[PDB]
Amino acid sequence: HLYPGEVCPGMDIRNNLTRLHELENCSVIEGHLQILLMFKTRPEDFRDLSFPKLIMITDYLLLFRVYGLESLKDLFPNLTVIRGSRLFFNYALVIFEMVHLKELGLYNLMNITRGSVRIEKNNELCYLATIDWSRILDSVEDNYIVLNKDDNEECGDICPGNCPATVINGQFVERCWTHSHCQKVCPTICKSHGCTAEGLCCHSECLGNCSQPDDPTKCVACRNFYLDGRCVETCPPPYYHFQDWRCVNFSFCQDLHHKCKNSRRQGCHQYVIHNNKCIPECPSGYTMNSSNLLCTPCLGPCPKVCHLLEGEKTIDSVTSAQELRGCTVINGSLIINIRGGNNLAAELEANLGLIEEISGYLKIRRSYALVSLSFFRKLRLIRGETLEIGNYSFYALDNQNLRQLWDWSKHNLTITQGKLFFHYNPKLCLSEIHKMEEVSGTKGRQERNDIALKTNGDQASCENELLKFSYIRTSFDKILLRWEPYWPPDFRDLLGFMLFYKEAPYQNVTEFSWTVVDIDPPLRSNSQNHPGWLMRGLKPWTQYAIFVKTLVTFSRTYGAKSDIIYVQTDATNPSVPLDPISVSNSSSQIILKWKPPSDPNGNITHYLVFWERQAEDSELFELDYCLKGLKLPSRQILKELEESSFRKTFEDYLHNVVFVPRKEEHRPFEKVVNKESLVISGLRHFTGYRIELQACNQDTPEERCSVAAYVSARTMPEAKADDIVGPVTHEIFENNVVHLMWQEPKEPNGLIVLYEVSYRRYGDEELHLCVSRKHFALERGCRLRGLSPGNYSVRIRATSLAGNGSWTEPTYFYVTD
Amino acid sequence: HLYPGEVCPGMDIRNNLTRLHELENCSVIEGHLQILLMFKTRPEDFRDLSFPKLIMITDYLLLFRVYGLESLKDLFPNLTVIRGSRLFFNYALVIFEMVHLKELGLYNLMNITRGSVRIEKNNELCYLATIDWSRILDSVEDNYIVLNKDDNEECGDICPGNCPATVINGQFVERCWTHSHCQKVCPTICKSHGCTAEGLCCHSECLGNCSQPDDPTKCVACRNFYLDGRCVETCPPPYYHFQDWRCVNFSFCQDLHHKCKNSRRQGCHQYVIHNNKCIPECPSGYTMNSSNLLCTPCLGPCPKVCHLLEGEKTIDSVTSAQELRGCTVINGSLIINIRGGNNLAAELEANLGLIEEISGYLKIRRSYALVSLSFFRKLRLIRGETLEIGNYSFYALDNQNLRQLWDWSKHNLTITQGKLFFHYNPKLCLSEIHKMEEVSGTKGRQERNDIALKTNGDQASCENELLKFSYIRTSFDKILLRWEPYWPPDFRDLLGFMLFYKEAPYQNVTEFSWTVVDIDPPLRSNSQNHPGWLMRGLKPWTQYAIFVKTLVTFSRTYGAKSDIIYVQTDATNPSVPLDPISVSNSSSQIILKWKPPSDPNGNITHYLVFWERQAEDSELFELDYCLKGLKLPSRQILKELEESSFRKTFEDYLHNVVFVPRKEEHRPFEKVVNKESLVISGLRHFTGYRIELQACNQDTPEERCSVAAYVSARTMPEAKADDIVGPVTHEIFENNVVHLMWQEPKEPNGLIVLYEVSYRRYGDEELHLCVSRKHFALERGCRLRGLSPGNYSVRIRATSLAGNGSWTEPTYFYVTD
Amino acid sequence: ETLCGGELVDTLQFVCGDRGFYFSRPARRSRGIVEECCFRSCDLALLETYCATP
Amino acid sequence: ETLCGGELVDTLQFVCGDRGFYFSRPARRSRGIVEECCFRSCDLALLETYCATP
Amino acid sequence: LCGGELVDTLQFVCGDRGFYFSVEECCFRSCDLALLETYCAT
Amino acid sequence: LCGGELVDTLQFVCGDRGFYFSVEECCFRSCDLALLETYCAT
């Protein structure tokens, strides 16, 4: 839908809500909105005010100490898009010292074109972590939200969700604005074109929200431009773009320029026309034409001078630099001081970089996020007419991240007067400064203690002297190092080389953990001896990153370093397979589990495992198990530097004074390949096994195998293996001696230790007798003596290693009465 | 004895030994001896040369690259004392690049008056660690002996020793010069007066060695002065002291002055007389008198100007400063650069400190051992006529130990032109620099970046703002901290306080281990809230040193610190006495040993120990010990700082923009006091004991006692306690049933389990029977059945817990045949 | 006594009171409030001059 | 090529050779040998001028 | 540190003044003595 | 490290060149490869 209402260019409301009524008819704001400094206000005075008509803010929104305000859900229920043409300290929405605020309430915000959001020191605001700034902004990392109620307190983020949720770092979370509304999230096919509640994609030109999908006539905010409701990407003539958000007829711009001309408002601009754009003033190379409002190109190279108040301007924010946008010649001096933490290269290059000459000096102090000075794209000449105090033209102080000053393969520069000045730039190096001095042409304009040697690049390896490695080769376990000798012009200044080495998982490692080792400087060969060094201890088959840096006393420093060379050592034998556990589920199936060794030290080609048969314990055969006690088992530095320097200086003094000028057992085995487990079949019942477990990580070039691991596995017995089979034959002598015959269970559960014979006569009781192995052998079974006359019912129980077998069926034998 | 021979003033021998013959008649040397630069020489050319006459060297001895020399024991067999009036780079004996030297050989050196010894880079010299420099020099720590054969190699120090030995650090070692001679060490009663071979003390005036003890007439070197052999402490008139080692008649000094006057030697001095001293020139305030050689005081304040070549002089050694001794006004500039490691305050104060005005500038660069600039005792004015490059008058650079500049309570200073300059003085602080600026009067002569704020005193706590502690009190286990609030002029700059604490054994601890903890800055009270902090974990009853230092961002720095306050926490209970071991040696004596607990946590007042009686194991009574199986037991940061600064700067920008100006069971116990052991008496034989060991470190204010420690102790049995006593009465029934009666050993070795009765008839064998506790109780003894007719010899063996008792005597009883 | 941000607003509306702070138009001078009262000490009149009606 | 202490003596007595180094008397100028050959490069003639006879 | 045991710290920092229970600020967070001093009210 | 085991280092730093025995410089001192390279002579 169109925007019915006065555009009402941006204003601010202070000291009373009676000034808030100017927005009674406002669909858009061509400016910035500031509501701040409200003290004598109460929440009872805010329940009535509401502005459903407000849709889009051009510049920014700032709220600063508005007492009594608890939520904006009643103030701006239709704030869709904040254009952010000009920011407030590189911020598009600032909410500062916002006492009494509970929830943000901006449940209609969709897209912020340019800028960031800084909300802090509210002391009462929650419902912040329950929002998704990724779909709102374009650079989330530039946000700044601290010192709210969310962190130090625990304001419960109770909200429907029902409402859509999304991941942030590693978990999903609902994205809700207030207790009743939530952020509208719809499929990514409409990146920014908007989408209806159902999910239909809006028009491509459209933005944020729309009523009729794929219809620019019924949109609420369209990204490109605006004209007569039915907005288009770029309006045709005779309509010229205005303020980067809408276009109007030439008559509008002409009468606005006439109004500014005749009414000498101090803030009015003589608007001109240049490429269908009613801009405040066209850039350098064009002149205001009295006849027609457009500025034709001039027949002369006249730049657009940029006069500066009091000859100075501090650049500490995007909005500070934006005042120089389009300017090309500065009639003053620039001091850059960006106290940040987020780089501003993009916006600085967009606003600056069109300047060519600086009348005064350029000063860079305390700036942090500046990684380079490349944003001065077209900086050519520094006149230095307004010289800095101390007679300087270039400055540098406490730049923590000034890496590169300029690219001198292509860039040009010129300094007229003054001298350079660099101090405490740990990421800037003297090579770049000396290139500064050579290219500028102020070589003879330098003095002592203007470019500190010990502060610039103190933590940046940039001595720019390369060192090669002669030859290296790695063995099974260790590695030998050797490199070409290096000597400064005065060889006594070399105190030895630093060696840096660490394990690098992947092919890239940061340059300057990092274990180091001292190296004794080599003897003066004056044949040359390569210094070399031998490492001590390492983890085999790992990627190692090594490099050597010389260490030379500061007298000019002429150190040297080597490239980061990655050296791969060899593999070795593995360790014991971790956690060797063997289990049995079936009579012949035993399942053994293991884990790969803690240090495999090589690609495990196969596992060599052996299962071995054992005999029953020798002492078991010689132990009787009917005797009482028959429990059968149920089987600090500066001093050294000064010492060197003192030795050198005494030698120098001596030389000065003295000299004057004239006037196998085949246990079954299997190569377990690509498996940390094994299942074995075909095992005897109730028989133990000795399992020898070992691993190898190399097969074809000889089996490089680990040590053996011993575990014990025992199988369960069969069902009816211990029962006595065969007839129970008995021999009766003249003394009624019963000599029992029975065939032993040739395949028992380990071994049968004893037998329990229970013979009972009709009306008599049950007797027992032990039949040990020696008893069963020497007597060839049992030998009963002294049996009363009558027929006895005999049950025999066989006692094996597993336990007592099933009783034999009652056998009846009749002796004479 | 006297010195027969020409004094032969000091010379040097180079390039041939044919110049070494000038010392054919030389008992003393009034100068320095230098033998150096010998290349075409061989050891075969050194066996002949010997100088037994040389006794004392005035200045120093230097040997530099004398090839073919292997030992000085044949060159200087009588070098007794080196006076060291003037040194060679603050060294009295230099041996440098001394190839082919094996042993020093100076077996006659006794005392070096002033200086040190530097021997290095010989590559062949050993027999160095076998010497005692303490009896030779007066300042051993000023020596410098490195890079010899002694360290990198293992030249065997085989020597007699026989020869005296002495301790150095923790062990004795013989002190030998060569393989045949050793350092002469004699009792300390003769500190330096000398002593004969037997041990008799020499004369008090004498020094080093003497022939007749307590006789100055027969000495070889006397410390004070010399005259006509029989030297005296101070020769009377008309003899005037000469060159601080001897005195001569006035005629000698007069003719020497005349010789220097008429013969215009460039090095000769017009010797004068001043206080019976033929000195080269008397100090400021005296004028050369043509009539008589002494210089009378003048009627005018004319100082002794000290003209300097090329207006500069570098002070890097004692001998460099000695050239200015006696000088008071410098017609040039002084640059002090002492690359050292040993302080030179004493000698610098002796030589310097008499200077008052400096025409040019004074520069101090790279000096290390200088702890203060107090050696400029009478420095008053710095004219600065010859200004330093960059227009400076005072300099400072890389002074690692410049603590204090001057004592401003009494000292005065004056600087005419130039400006101060301080950089990289980690031990010097801005307070002293500003006091310099105020006292000098050059306050308006300063510019930016001449006195770096971040380099001077960066590692010296000197913000000189004191912080008090409100109240503290320490409990049984922990301690609470609280102090008065502090606020810089801009309160946003306070990021919190640093807390430093460590355990200090004794009352003194170094100021700035040292565990630290971050403190959150307190809320703005605008009643004031004391910040305070609580400790977490400590070792009780220990002396703790605590102090708090504020941490404020650099914008002027206005930090604050507190005094080192020592807080003593309280004591607690001790631990278990370490290694509780109990042993027994006698029937009633059990000796138990223990160690004090690892953490006593208190003065151990006494040990509370209990021994308790136990009963025999219940299952023992119910266990039969004749059954088979009878085994009876034989019983990184800058990001946070920038976050704070960025928050502050955004708040400042907001304030700038918004506001505009208008137009108990009694087990016996004993309190073991002051003993880690105990011996207990009166214990039953063969009875165990349960020992409960515990310790207490507090008695009168309630017994603060540790936990109990349980150990087991068993006593040995008696001699004849298990033997059966009383007659072996037997009752015989009609069935010849023998019922044995015997009285049990009421006090046995624990308990008797069984009995072994062995009755044997004449010609029969021995029988056995078990008599268990139940057998002995129910049957009231033993009950034998079925004994063959005849008289049996009965031996009874009692089986107790200890073992089998002695057999009873053969008892004979006759049954009817 | 110097006063800085945070508490500067608290001091304001108390020294000024009742009436607010005037505002005409932006019309940077860089002498606004911080380098008047925070960096250097400022008196009552320099706060009163930021009022609206008087 | 610059040469410094230690090896400076080795270079001497080879460039000079046979004859030694002259010595008259101390008669500090501070341009002796180190700032002629160690700090800055020095040629053959500057070493030859330290000989005795020539 | 948690409830029951934590009472010693409150009696340490408050003495003979007493306190009301609430451990959620020390079992998971760090005891900074700022909450402890205001836990006990006169 | 000491004799017997130390031979691997000499074969490492000398290869197929061989060496003569002498351990007194590595059992108590530190092996800096300066002595090892000169231990084996061609």
Q: 3-state secondary structure string, chain D?
A: CCCCCCHHHHHCCCCCCCCCCCCCCCCCCCCCCHHHHHCCCCCHHHHHCCCCCC
Record: contact D6-A492, CB cut-off 8 A: yes
Place of tokens 């009210």: E41
Q: Which residue of A has its CA nearest to B400?
A: A638
Q: Could you tell me which residues are beta bridge partners of residue A103?
A: A71
Contact A619, A748 (CB under 8 A): no
Contact B767, B759 (CB under 8 A): yes
Could you tell me the two tokens for B300? 């005018």
Q: Could you tell me which residues are beta bridge partners of residue A467?
A: A562
Among C11, C34, C36, C39, the strongest candidate for a mutation testing the B interface, having the largest count of B CBs within 10 A, is: C34
Phi, psi of A4 (to 5 degrees): -80, 110
Reduced to 3 states (helix: H, G, I; strand: E, B; else coil), residue B252 is: helix
Reduced to 3 states (helix: H, G, I; strand: E, B; else coil), residue A182 is: strand
b/e burial code for range A150-181 (CB count within 10 A of at least 16 → b): beeeebebebeeebebeeeeeeebbbbbbeeb
- Concatenating the DSSP letter of every residue in A578-602 gives EEEEEEE-SSS-EEEEEE--SS--S
Longest CA pairwise span in chain A (Å): 157
Contacts of B249 (CB under 8 A, 6+ apart): B238, B239
**What separation in angstroms does the CA of B149 have from each of A164, B133, B264?**
82, 18, 49
What span, in angstroms and rounded, lies between the C-alpha atoms of B109 and B544? 52
Binding-face residues of A in 355-384 toward F, CB within 8 A: none
CA distance from start to end of chain C: 24
E-state strands within B61-207: 61-66, 81-82, 93-96, 111-112, 117-120, 144-146, 165-167, 172-174
Query: Cα–Cα–Cα angle for B132, B138, B143, nearest 5°?
Result: 65
Asked if the C-beta of B516 comes within 8 angstroms of chain D's C-beta atoms, the answer is no
Backbone Cα Rg of chain F: 9
Q: How many CB atoms lie within 10 A of CB A11?
A: 15
Contact D20, B65 (CB under 8 A): no
Please name the member of D21, D27, D29 whose beta carbon is closest to the beta carbon of B266: D27
What span, in angstroms and rounded, lies between the C-alpha atoms of B748 and B685? 8
What span, in angstroms and rounded, lies between the C-alpha atoms of A148 and B35? 83
Asked if the C-beta of B65 comes within 8 angstroms of chain D's C-beta atoms, the answer is yes
Could you tell me the two tokens for B488? 């810089």
Number of Cα atoms under 13 Å in the Cβ half of residue A593:
4
Q: How many CB atoms lie within 10 A of CB B816?
A: 7
Q: Could you tell me which residues are beta bridge partners of residue B329?
A: B305, B357
What span, in angstroms and rounded, lies between the C-alpha atoms of A351 and A457? 30
- Concatenating the DSSP letter of every residue in B485-510 gives ----SSGGGEEEEEEEEEE-SSS---
What span, in angstroms and rounded, lies between the C-alpha atoms of B350 and B336? 16
Using omega within 30 degrees of 0 as the cis cutoff, is the peptide bond preceding B238 cis?
A: yes
Longest CA pairwise span in chain F (Å): 27
Closest C-alpha among A313, C36, A395, A338 to residue B649: A338
Number of Cα atoms under 13 Å in the Cβ half of residue D52:
12
Record: contact B658-A340, CB cut-off 8 A: no
Q: Which CATH number fits domain B466-568: 2.60.40.10, 1.10.10.10, 2.60.40.1930, 3.30.230.10?
A: 2.60.40.10
Place of tokens 């509208």: A184
SS3 of A546-578: EEEEEEECCCCCCCCEECCEEEECCCCCCCCCE
Binding-face residues of C in 16-35 toward A, CB within 8 A: 19-21, 23, 25-30
Please name the member of A475, A532, A533 whose beta carbon is closest to the beta carbon of F12: A475
Overall CATH class of domain B578-629+668-714: mainly beta
Record: contact E31-B532, CB cut-off 8 A: no
Which H helix or E strand runs over B323?
Answer: none
Q: Which residue of B has its CA nearest to A88?
A: B654
CATH superfamily placement of domain A1-185: Receptor L-domain (3.80.20.20)
Backbone Cα Rg of chain E: 9
Contact A370, A401 (CB under 8 A): yes
Phi, psi of A120 (to 5 degrees): -160, 160
Q: Which residues of D touch A526 (CB under 8 A)?
A: 7
Closest C-alpha among A566, A569, A567, A564 to residue A548: A564
Query: Cα–Cα–Cα angle for B59, B64, B67, nearest 5°?
Result: 135
Asked if the C-beta of E14 comes within 8 angstroms of chain B's C-beta atoms, the answer is no
Contact A811, A794 (CB under 8 A): yes
Q: Which residues of A touch F31 (CB under 8 A)?
A: 534, 536
Number of Cα atoms under 13 Å in the Cβ half of residue B16:
9
Record: contact B536-E33, CB cut-off 8 A: no
Record: contact D5-A651, CB cut-off 8 A: yes
Asked if the C-beta of B536 comes within 8 angstroms of chain E's C-beta atoms, the answer is yes
DSSP symbol at B766: B
Closest C-alpha among B382, B381, B310, B376 to residue B345: B376
Q: Which residue of C has its CA nearest to B651?
A: C5
Query: Cα–Cα–Cα angle for A643, A646, A647, nearest 5°?
Result: 85
Contacts of B642 (CB under 8 A, 6+ apart): A339, A340, A341, A368
Phi, psi of B2 (to 5 degrees): -65, 180
Using omega within 30 degrees of 0 as the cis cutoff, is the peptide bond preceding B633 cis?
A: no
Contacts of A629 (CB under 8 A, 6+ apart): B627, B628, B629
Record: contact E12-B475, CB cut-off 8 A: yes
Closest C-alpha among A50, A154, A481 to residue F13: A481
Record: contact E37-B532, CB cut-off 8 A: yes
**Long-range CB contact pairs, B3-9, < 8 A, 24+:** B3/B27, B3/B28, B3/B55, B3/B226, B3/B229, B5/B53
Q: How far is CA B280 from the centre of its chain?
A: 46
Chain B nearest C-alpha distance from C30 (Å)? 8
Contact B26, B13 (CB under 8 A): no
Q: Environment class of residue B228 by beta-carbon count within 10 Å: exposed (0-12), middle (13-18) or buried (19+)?
A: exposed
Closest C-alpha among A465, A621, A476 to residue A557: A465
Please name the member of B492, B651, B661 whose beta carbon is closest to the beta carbon of C49: B661
Please name the member of D13, D20, D25 whose beta carbon is closest to the beta carbon of B267: D25
Closest C-alpha among B480, A76, A518, A22 to residue F30: A518
Q: How far is CA A782 from the centre of its chain?
A: 81
Q: How many CB atoms lie within 10 A of CB A63?
A: 22
Place of tokens 């928050």: B647
What span, in angstroms and rounded, lies between the C-alpha atoms of A688 and B23? 101
Reduced to 3 states (helix: H, G, I; strand: E, B; else coil), residue B696 is: strand
Backbone Cα Rg of chain C: 11
DSSP symbol at A134: G
What span, in angstroms and rounded, lies between the C-alpha atoms of B29 and B7? 6
Contact A374, A345 (CB under 8 A): yes
Q: Which residue of C has its CA nearest to B647?
A: C5
Phi, psi of B761 (to 5 degrees): -90, 165
What span, in angstroms and rounded, lies between the C-alpha atoms of B77 and B74? 6
- Concatenating the DSSP letter of every residue in B534-602 gives E-----SS-EEEEEEEEEE--------EE--EEEE-------PPEEEEEEE-SSS-EEEEEE--SS--S
Phi, psi of A89 (to 5 degrees): 55, 60
Please name the member of A490, A655, A662 whose beta carbon is closest to the beta carbon of D22: A662
Chains B and A, touching by 3 or more CB pairs within 8 angstroms: yes
Q: Which CATH number fits domain B305-440: 3.80.20.20, 2.40.160.10, 3.10.129.10, 3.40.920.10?
A: 3.80.20.20
Name the amino acid, one letter, at A812.
Y
Contact A133, A140 (CB under 8 A): yes
Chains E and D, touching by 3 or more CB pairs within 8 angstroms: no
What span, in angstroms and rounded, lies between the C-alpha atoms of B71 and B46? 9
What span, in angstroms and rounded, lies between the C-alpha atoms of B307 and B586? 96
What span, in angstroms and rounded, lies between the C-alpha atoms of A338 and A320? 10
3-state class percentages of chain C: helix first, strand second, coil last, to nearest 5: 30, 0, 70
**What separation in angstroms does the CA of A515 have from each of A501, A502, A547?**
6, 6, 11
Could you tell me the two tokens for B209? 């060695």
Could you tell me the two tokens for A531? 């210094």
Query: Cα–Cα–Cα angle for B652, B657, B660, nearest 5°?
Result: 115
Contact A29, A8 (CB under 8 A): yes
What span, in angstroms and rounded, lies between the C-alpha atoms of A65 and A96? 7
Handedness of CA C21, C22, C25, C31 (dihedral sign): negative
Contacts of A741 (CB under 8 A, 6+ apart): A727, A728, A729, A730, A731, A780, A781
What span, in angstroms and rounded, lies between the C-alpha atoms of B105 and B95? 13
**What separation in angstroms does the CA of C20 have from each of A63, B544, C23, C50?**
16, 56, 9, 9
**Long-range CB contact pairs, A484-490, < 8 A, 24+:** A484/A530, A485/A522, A485/A525, A485/A528, A485/A529, A485/A530, A485/A531, A486/A550, A486/A560, A488/A552, A488/A558, A488/A559, A489/A558, A489/D2, A490/A555, A490/D2, A490/D4, A490/D38, A490/D39
Could you tell me the two tokens for B547? 């102090």
Contact B752, B799 (CB under 8 A): yes
Chains C and B, touching by 3 or more CB pairs within 8 angstroms: yes
Contacts of A688 (CB under 8 A, 6+ apart): A614, A635, A712, A713, A714, A715
Reduced to 3 states (helix: H, G, I; strand: E, B; else coil), residue A234 is: coil
Asked if the C-beta of E11 comes within 8 angstroms of chain B's C-beta atoms, the answer is no
Place of tokens 């004449």: B762
- Concatenating the DSSP letter of every residue in B174-198 gives E-BSSSS-B-----TTSSSS-B-SS
Place of tokens 């105020």: B438
Q: How many CB atoms lie within 10 A of CB B712?
A: 10
Among A480, A529, A548, A569, the strongest candidate for a mutation testing the F interface, having the largest count of F CBs within 10 A, is: A480
Among B474, B518, B534, the strongest candidate for a mutation testing the E interface, having the largest count of E CBs within 10 A, is: B534
Give domain limits for chain A.
Answer: 1-185, 239-297, 305-440, 466-568, 578-629+668-714, 725-815
Could you tell me the two tokens for B798? 């009692």
Name the amino acid, one letter, at B667.
R
Q: Could you tell me which residues are beta bridge partners of residue B117?
A: B93
- Concatenating the DSSP letter of every residue in B426-477 gives TT--HHHHHHHHHHHT-TTS--TTSB-TTTTTTTS-----EE-----EE-SS
Reduced to 3 states (helix: H, G, I; strand: E, B; else coil), residue B151 is: helix
Q: Environment class of residue B335 by beta-carbon count within 10 Å: exposed (0-12), middle (13-18) or buried (19+)?
A: middle
Could you tell me the two tokens for A16? 């009373």
Phi, psi of A213 (to 5 degrees): -60, 145
CATH 2.60.40.10, applies to A725-815: yes
Backbone Cα Rg of chain D: 11
Asked if the C-beta of D13 comes within 8 angstroms of chain A's C-beta atoms, the answer is no
What span, in angstroms and rounded, lies between the C-alpha atoms of A732 and C25? 136
Domains A1-185 and A305-440 in one fold: yes
Q: Could you tell me which residues are beta bridge partners of residue B497?
A: B550
Q: Which residues of A touch D21 (CB under 8 A)?
A: 659-660
Chains F and E, touching by 3 or more CB pairs within 8 angstroms: no
Contact A478, A534 (CB under 8 A): yes
Contact A547, A454 (CB under 8 A): no
Name the amino acid, one letter, at A443.
K
SS3 of A57-125: ECCCEEEEEECCCCECCCCCCCCCEECCCCCCCCCCEEEECCCCCCECCCCCCCEECCCCEEEECCCCC
SS3 of A663-676: CCCCCCEEEECCCC
Q: How many CB atoms lie within 10 A of CB F31?
A: 16
What span, in angstroms and rounded, lies between the C-alpha atoms of A420 and A413? 13
Could you tell me the two tokens for A492? 């006594």
- Concatenating the DSSP letter of every residue in B594-659 gives EE--SS--S---EEEEEEE--PPPHHHHT--SSSS---------HHHHHHHHHHHHHHHHHHHHH-
Between A and B, how many residue pairs show a Cβ–Cβ distance under 8 A? 78
Chain B nearest C-alpha distance from C45 (Å)? 11
Q: Environment class of residue B444 by beta-carbon count within 10 Å: exposed (0-12), middle (13-18) or buried (19+)?
A: exposed
**Domains of chain F listed by start with CATH number:** 7-39 (1.10.100.10)
Phi, psi of B563 (to 5 degrees): -70, 155
